[PDB]
Each structure stands twice: as C-alpha cells, then as structure tokens.
C-alpha cells in the first residue's frame, strides 16, 4: 500500500467496510498506519473494526476445528486447525506490530493511548486463547499488563461512562473470566464498572446516554451469564 495516498487508503477502508470486505479493510488501514502519522478517532475505529472482524472469523473457525479435534481424540483435523491457528497468530502479530511501531509510543491523549492499549490487551488475549506452550503464561501476562495500563489511565483521565473506558473494562473482565481463571475478579470488575457508570449517566446528553447504556448492557449480559 506504499504507493497509495493516505486519504485514498482511508476512503477505500470505508468502502471495504460497506462491502463487508474486512480483509481488504484491514490491509487498507495497515497501509494508512504505515504512513507514520497519528490516527484520528474515526481512523482508530476503522483500524479496530477491520482487524476485529478478520480475527473474529478466524477465532470462530478455530473453535469449530478445535471442537472437532477434541471429539476425535488421521492428521488432517489437527493439520487444518494448526493452519488456521497459524494464520490467526499472524494477524495478531501484525496488529501488535502496528501498535508497537509506532502507534502506542506516539499516543499522548488519554482517548488514543487507552484505545491502543485496549487493542494490545485484546490481541494478546486472542493469542492466549490458542496458546499451549512455553510462552502461554508470558502471553497472558502481556495481555494483563496492557489492560492494566489502560485501566490505570482510564480511571484517572476519563469519566466512568466513557465508551472506551466501558469497553476496556468489559474486555478486561472477559480476560479475567475466560483467560486468567479469575471469575470473581471478572464479576467484581463488571459490577463496579456498571455501578459507577450508572451513577454518571445523569451528566450525559441523550446521544451519549445511548452510547454508554449500550455497553453497560453488555456488562449486564455477562453478569447474568456469570451469576
């Protein structure tokens, strides 16, 4: 994508989103990031949506194949699960590489820095979902560390209803429940996040109220699943 204008890459990423061509979307946003300029709020969302959809499809396929493989226990099911797993790891490594070179170090504002650290936690979480070897504990701690830094910034710099703060807490609670085997930590985080957001809703416009309550409902859905 080196020869395409930054603005054209962004425009094409929006077109790919409309066409549900998320692999193209991700490639266009990777090219935009590699132009070296910081990303706007809208552009960060495009980056996130693109890679979340790509890796989301890979995760769904990996779980189908992993389930078939467990029920079987020739080499084909394992081989094909491994192929999908390797492609997923490649996508996660690519996103983490963009965050490390150099999105996070140039992100000074709370909204951008928390967004990218949440992203870093998420893609290490996806690596953790498939990890089974020597570095699985280190992968888990890398997710935890990124989420923790994002939480610390979000609590000092953002209101409790901020959608990025809410989505971060939601995902860190899923990390606790699903990855870290800390379901009590997951439940406490979801409840405390929901309750403090509830008490701040009175400050919001109708549109901001809608944004915040939509994510609070996801916290509620998990608490209902977990308790």
């Amino acid at each position: 994508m080196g020869s395409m204008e930054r603005a054209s890459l962004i425009q094409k990423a929006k077109l790919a989103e409309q066409a549900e061509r998320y692999e193209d979307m991700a490639a266009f946003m990777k090219g935009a990031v590699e132009k070296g300029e910081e990303l706007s709020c809208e552009e960060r969302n495009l980056l996130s949506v693109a890679y979340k959809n790509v890796v989301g499809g890979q995760r769904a396929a990996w779980r189908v194949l992993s389930s078939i493989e467990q029920k079987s226990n020739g080499p084909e099911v394992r081989e094909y699960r491994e192929k999908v797993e390797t492609e997923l790891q490649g996508v996660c490594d690519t996103v983490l590489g963009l965050l490390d070179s150099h999105l996070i170090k140039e992100a000074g504002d709370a909204e951008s820095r928390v967004f990218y650290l949440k992203m870093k936690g998420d893609y290490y979480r996806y690596l953790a979902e498939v990890a089974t070897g020597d570095d699985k504990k280190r992968i888990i701690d890398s997710a935890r560390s990124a989420y923790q830094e994002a939480m610390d910034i979000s609590k000092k710099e953002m209101p409790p209803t901020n959608p990025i703060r809410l989505g971060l807490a939601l995902n860190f609670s899923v990390f606790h429940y699903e990855i870290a085997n800390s379901p009590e930590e997951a439940i406490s985080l979801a409840k405390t996040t929901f309750d403090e957001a509830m008490a701040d809703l009175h400050t919001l416009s109708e549109d901001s109220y809608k944004d915040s309550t939509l994510i609070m409902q996801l916290l509620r859905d998990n608490l209902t699943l977990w308790t």
């Binding site: 939601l170 899923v174 996801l218 977990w226």
Partner: peptide, 7 residues
Amino acid sequence: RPSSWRQ
C-alpha cells in the same frame, strides 16, 4: 460464551 465489546 461471554460478550466482549463489538461494533
């Protein structure tokens, strides 16, 4: 099973 953030 649980919900993470989604757009």
